[PDB]
């Protein structure tokens, strides 16, 4: 039993809710919150901008030191950093951005990073301003992640479109 509440169960291990991941994180303080990152960990907008703002820019400061030491992530890759005031850890995961030209086959690889963590609070990867179809993304998530994932979908209209159509 964990402290998440109000989620619709999609499968044995995937749950979904119409919520802001930032507010969910502040309420639950999960072990792992997933950021929808880019390879540079430049947290400008979307989920990343919102999470970083909630940390008072501490996420960005930590991220810049990470990149200065290690260089950029791979598309489809991830790194574990601090969760600051929002969670124990933040798993920064890079889904492909098709508005940048990135290969959507890499979305499965991105979701595979979730399997290294027993429980996660996450957004849909590559959706929103990353330009991919959120219905597709949800399907890849369900077909790839085997650990317990709690998905927060902020957009109400999209959320309604997703659950009622989830096969
Ligand atoms: O509604 C959706 C579906 C796709 C995803 C998205 C991911 C990357 C960039 C833009 C959007 N998204 N946004 C969020 N999901 C949960 N919490 C959130 N807090 C603030 C925002 Cl934006 C947000």
UniProtKB/Swiss-Prot annotation:
Localisation per UniProt entry: Host endoplasmic reticulum membrane
Domain Macro, residue spans: 1-167
Activity regulation text: Inhibited in vitro by GRL-0617.
Membrane-protein topology: Multi-pass membrane protein
Superkingdom: Viruses
Catalytic activity: Thiol-dependent hydrolysis of ester, thioester, amide, peptide and isopeptide bonds formed by the C-terminal Gly of ubiquitin (a 76-residue protein attached to proteins as an intracellular targeting signal)
Assembly information from the UniProt record: May form homohexamers. Interacts with N protein.
Function noted in UniProt: Responsible for the cleavages located at the N-terminus of the replicase polyprotein. Participates together with nsp4 in the assembly of virally-induced cytoplasmic double-membrane vesicles necessary for viral replication. Antagonizes innate immune induction of type I interferon by blocking the phosphorylation, dimerization and subsequent nuclear translocation of host IRF3. Also prevents host NF-kappa-B signaling. In addition, PL-PRO possesses a deubiquitinating/deISGylating activity and processes both 'Lys-48'- and 'Lys-63'-linked polyubiquitin chains from cellular substrates.
Protein name from the UniProt record: Papain-like protease nsp3
Organism: Severe acute respiratory syndrome coronavirus 2 (2019-nCoV)
Gene: rep
